Each structure stands twice: as structure tokens, then as C-alpha cells.
């Protein structure tokens, strides 16, 4: 199910947030990650040697803690018999926290999504940078590799390199050694070749489409010999699939040996997709401002109000955003209020005396707003869109408009 996947993603996001905060002493923590194809025996051996090396670390507190961390991860790996699909992630350590509570901790988990990253690290903190990068990059891309020998279809997350399907073909020879038949054989050769293109296109429709709408956000044709060209510029290739064709890549090799080549050449064009979608989005937002319309809104004080009411269609946010949702509470009367505060207005603020009654109105701790948007944008209108500061329109949105706004479902008036 899709909802169950979303819950698992959120659980793991929460888990990562708790691990980032952790911290401990020296280099006690053991950030370990395993890729899916890898053998467990090989990792178990590695850890055993690392345990051996640690067995002469001059320090006391560091050494013992590290040995016990490596001991624990080795035991965790004994519980598995193979590295599960999606890879494995193991985070062992001896965390310090409040109440002087030097507690040991071990979190192995099969992560959501296939990850391609190996990692071993020891440090004072847990290294959850690779995971956060996989959570950000959800843009799957598709990869068709054409060749006279045989095709290949595959997919490509930020890290992960998939193979969906492939075939080979027994195509005819270039030449026909009869004068009259040369013409006919040539026409027959061109028909067989077109039927191959037709077959490839049909297989692409089967694979890359999901519920009459393409799952992949990009689509790379690679190969040689103006064959990938035939696929892009052809009426047989379906337009809904064809419209997202981003590169035609000239490679050497064919099949899996060329798949990686095609990725490397295509890497620059693939990274630019997110940037283009941002430009289109913010460009559409700024259209409304250029004309009268009045659909657009901006700033927490306005955009949230718009969101509460006659809702937004699209809510556009900067990635980073400072602004934070605090929960203010009264000592005596039990009155409360929530406010969305900037970095200066949140850090120190004499505003929060109750005034009417005459008491100190204590600010009970925050949940950060952009996270707040992510929590319950389903509650409001929907389509939470994060955008960077890189594009010229994006930089305007961040610097000028404060990195927050929304495109509204209908016209709205405002006051004050």
C-alpha cells in the first residue's frame, strides 16, 4: 500500500532525526551501512579485524566502548543470514544524554528503498548523511539502451542502479548479393529493423508506465548507430512516454556494460531536472503576481491564513526555512496560543507576558514549521512543493518573498 509506505518513510525520517542528535565520546559510534548485493561474511570479517585493531587503542574510555560496539554489530549480523534487499544499515554506539545517562544503543534496519552506498565510520556522532540524501532524491529515472545486438531497460535513483528488462535479437545482414533482390532485401531489412523499434517501444510502455501515467520523471535513450534516434523521432513511441525523453546518449558498448557509461554521460542532464521543475513552478507562481489575478499569497502571516480558509492549490516553501511553530502556555489561567516565529523573534522575546491577567506566559517548546507543513499538508489543499534558492526566480522567492507562499484555488481578498 501507498499509505503504509508513507508511514514507514516517516518512521525512518523520525529515526534518522533522533540518531543525528545523539552524540557521545571520542569515536565510540559505529556508523555502518551495507549495500544489497554484498555478502555478510565479508562484513563480519571486516568488523573482526576492526575489533582487532581497536584492541590496541591507547585510551581507556574510547577503546572499551568501541570494542563493545563492534561486538554488538557482529552479533546483529549473525542474526541475519543474508544482507536483505534494500541493503542493511547498522548504527552501534554508546550515547551520552541528559541525566548523565551513558546508554548503549544498536539500531539495525532494512531501510525503505534500495540503497547503493557502503559505509563504515567511527565517530562521536552517527553519520546519517547518506540516508537523508536518499530520502530527498525520490526522482526515479528510466534508461533505455538501444543497440543492433540487443536492448536494455533500467532505472536509476540517485544512488541505485536497476535492471528492469532486456533482450537480444537475430537481425539480418547489411547487404544482399543480388541485383534485383538487393532492393527487396533492403526493404525487408528496414521492416525487420522497424519491428525491433516497435517492439522496444511497446516494452517501454509496459515497463515505465504505471496506471496510464509514467512513473519515471526522466527517460534516457542511449546506444549508437542512430537507433535511439529512430525511437525518439518516431510515431510508434507513445507521446506520454516520449514527452519526457531528456537525453539521446552516444555510447560505446551495449547492454549492462554500457548502462553505467550512459548514466555517467547523462548525469549532468539528470541533476538539472529538479532545477527545471522549480523554475516552472515558481515561474507559474510569479505569473499570478505579474498579472492582477490575486490567486498568489506570501508570508507565514498570510499564507497560513489562506491555507486555513479557502485553501491553497499549491503551497511553495524554501527547503531551509528558519520559521518555527512554538506553543505558548499560561501558568495560572491555563490559556494558550501558538505562533510562527522568526530566528530573532523566537530566541529572545519579552512579548510573552500575559498582560491582561498579569503573568509570565511561558513558551513551551517548538515543532519546526516546514516539518509542520510536511505533517499536515494533506489536511490542507495539498501539493507541498519545496524549492531551492538556485534559480533566478527561486532566489527572488527566497530572498524577496521570504521563501514561503502559495498558488490559490480561487481569488482571495486580504486586509491588514
Amino acid at each position: 500500500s501507498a499509505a503504509d509506505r508513507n508511514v514507514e518513510i516517516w518512521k525512518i525520517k523520525k529515526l534518522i532525526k533522533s540518531l543525528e542528535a545523539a552524540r557521545g565520546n571520542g569515536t565510540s559510534m559505529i556508523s555502518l551501512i551495507i549495500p544489497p548485493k554484498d555478502q555478510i561474511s565479508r562484513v563480519a570479517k571486516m568488523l573482526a579485524d576492526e575489533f582487532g585493531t581497536a584492541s590496541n587503542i591507547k585510551s581507556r574510555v574510547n577503546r572499551l566502548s568501541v570494542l563493545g560496539a563492534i561486538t554488538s554489530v557482529q552479533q546483529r549480523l549473525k542474526l541475519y543470514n543474508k544482507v536483505p534487499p534494500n541493503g542493511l544499515v547498522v548504527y552501534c554506539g554508546t550515547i551520552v544524554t541528559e541525566e548523565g545517562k551513558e546508554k548503549k544503543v544498536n539500531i539495525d534496519f532494512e531501510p525503505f528503498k534500495p540503497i547503493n552506498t557502503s559505509l563504515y565510520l567511527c565517530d562521536n556522532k552517527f553519520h546519517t548523511e547518506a540516508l537523508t540524501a536518499l530520502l530527498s532524491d525520490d526522482s526515479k529515472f528510466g534508461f533505455i539502451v538501444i543497440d543492433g545486438s540487443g536492448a536494455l531497460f533500467g532505472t536509476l535513483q540517485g544512488n541505485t542502479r536497476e535492471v528492469l528488462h532486456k533482450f537480444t535479437v537475430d537481425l539480418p545482414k547489411k547487404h544482399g548479393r543480388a541485383a534485383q533482390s538487393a532492393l527487396r532485401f533492403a526493404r525487408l531489412r528496414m521492416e525487420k529493423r522497424h519491428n525491433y523499434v516497435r517492439k522496444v517501444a511497446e516494452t517501454a510502455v509496459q515497463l515505465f508506465i504505471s496506471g496510464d501515467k509514467v512513473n519515471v520523471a526522466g527517460l534516457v535513450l542511449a546506444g549508437s548507430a542512430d537507433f535511439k534516434t529512430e525511437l525518439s523521432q518516431s510515431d510508434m513511441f507513445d507521446q506520454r512516454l516520449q514527452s519526457k525523453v531528456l537525453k539521446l546518449v552516444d555510447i560505446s558498448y551495449g547492454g549492462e556494460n554500457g548502462f553505467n557509461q550512459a548514466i555517467e554521460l547523462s548525469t549532468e542532464v539528470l541533476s538539472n531536472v529538479k532545477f527545471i521543475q522549480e523554475k516552472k513552478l515558481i515561474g507559474r507562481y510569479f505569473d499570478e503576481i505579474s498579472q492582477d489575478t490575486g490567486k498568489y499569497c506570501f508570508g507565514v502571516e498570510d499564507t497560513l491564513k489562506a491555507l486555513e480558509m479557502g485553501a491553497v492549490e499549491i503551497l511553495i516553501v524554501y527547503e531551509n526555512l528558519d520559521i518555527m511553530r512554538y506553543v505558548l502556555h499560561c501558568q495560572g489561567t491555563e490559556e494558550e496560543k501558538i505562533l510562527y516565529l522568526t530566528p530573532e523573534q523566537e530566541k529572545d522575546k519579552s512579548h510573552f507576558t500575559d498582560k491582561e491577567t498579569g503573568q509570565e506566559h511561558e513558551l513551551i517548546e517548538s515543532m519546526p514549521l516546514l516539518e509542520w507543513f510536511a505533517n499536515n499538508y494533506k489536511k490542507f489543499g495539498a501539493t507541498l512543493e519545496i524549492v531551492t534558492d538556485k534559480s533566478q526566480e527561486g532566489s527572488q522567492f527566497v530572498k524577496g518573498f521570504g521563501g514561503i507562499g502559495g498558488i490559490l484555488r480561487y481569488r482571495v481578498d486580504f486586509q491588514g
Partner: protein, 163 residues
């Protein structure tokens, strides 16, 4: 309220409907709210206070603004009061399967329902109103284990008691 910003009396009414709880999607104030001195969050809290502990399965909200103090009331709709007098109360979040059980009798309880109707209907007294409110029920299905339709024709009660 006409030229700039003036309250001569302000007993201004406007009809909102639906209000089980606060509602995140809200849509309570704007347009009519802020211009006229009624705020937003406080107005939502007052609406929750009036429409709290029954009804929590949809309500009606006439909002009589006295300058800044709104007077929320629950004017009765027939289907709402039937749903209030059901097998209560599994409020929200399961729930889910669904709100259409509809085997909750109400024989002499609907007599109160026809009485509380704000005159209306262009009736010849309850004899005809009984027929109306006995069919408003999409869910209830009338007495113990009855149908609605033609059992209504043979009524033998409450003709002279409902005025």
C-alpha cells in the same frame, strides 16, 4: 458598516453549517469574519464551545454577531437530530464503517422532532408532518425492524398533542 467603520447596533446574522469539532480546514471566518470585528481563532473556539458535547456528527451554525461577541446556536435539521438520537457515540477515526447502522427505533421521539419544526411545511398539523419526518430518515429505518414507505399511512397517534 457602510462608509468606513461604524457600529450603530450590529445584530448581524449569517448562516454557516457543519461543525463537529474545531476543523483544521476551518473556512469559518474570512470574507464575512474580519470586516465586522469578529476575529478567527477566538471565533472558532467559541463555535467549538457551543457545538461541543452533541452534536459531534455534523451541526448547523447561525452566527449572530453582537459587535464582537458571536452567539452560535444549533438550529435543528431533521436528519441531524435523527443521527444525534442514534446509538452514540463513536465520534471520529473509526467510525469508518461508516455512519449508516440505522436500526434505532424512535417512535415517540420523532413526535418531539415534528414539534420542534419552526412551524414551516404549510401543514395540516402533525398528521402530515409525521409522514415527512418518518421519511427524512435515510438511515434510521423507523420502528424496531420496520420499513418507512406505506406503514406511515396507518398512523393512530399524536394528532391533537403536537400543536
Amino acid at each position: 458598516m457602510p462608509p468606513k467603520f461604524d457600529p450603530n447596533e450590529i445584530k448581524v446574522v449569517y448562516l454557516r453549517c457543519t461543525g463537529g469539532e474545531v476543523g483544521a480546514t476551518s473556512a469559518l471566518a474570512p470574507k464575512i469574519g474580519p470586516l465586522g470585528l469578529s476575529p478567527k481563532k477566538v471565533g472558532d473556539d467559541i463555535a467549538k464551545a457551543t457545538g461541543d458535547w452533541k452534536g459531534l456528527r455534523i451541526t448547523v451554525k447561525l452566527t449572530i454577531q453582537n459587535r464582537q461577541a458571536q452567539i452560535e446556536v444549533v438550529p435543528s435539521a431533521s436528519a441531524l437530530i435523527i443521527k444525534a438520537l442514534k446509538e452514540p457515540p463513536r465520534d471520529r477515526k473509526k467510525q469508518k464503517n461508516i455512519k449508516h447502522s440505522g436500526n434505532i427505533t424512535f417512535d415517540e421521539i420523532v413526535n418531539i422532532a415534528r414539534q420542534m419544526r419552526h412551524r414551516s411545511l404549510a401543514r395540516e398539523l402533525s398528521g402530515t408532518i409525521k409522514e415527512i419526518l418518518g421519511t427524512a430518515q435515510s438511515v434510521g429505518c423507523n420502528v424496531d425492524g420496520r420499513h418507512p414507505h406505506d406503514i406511515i399511512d396507518d398512523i393512530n397517534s399524536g394528532a391533537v398533542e403536537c400543536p
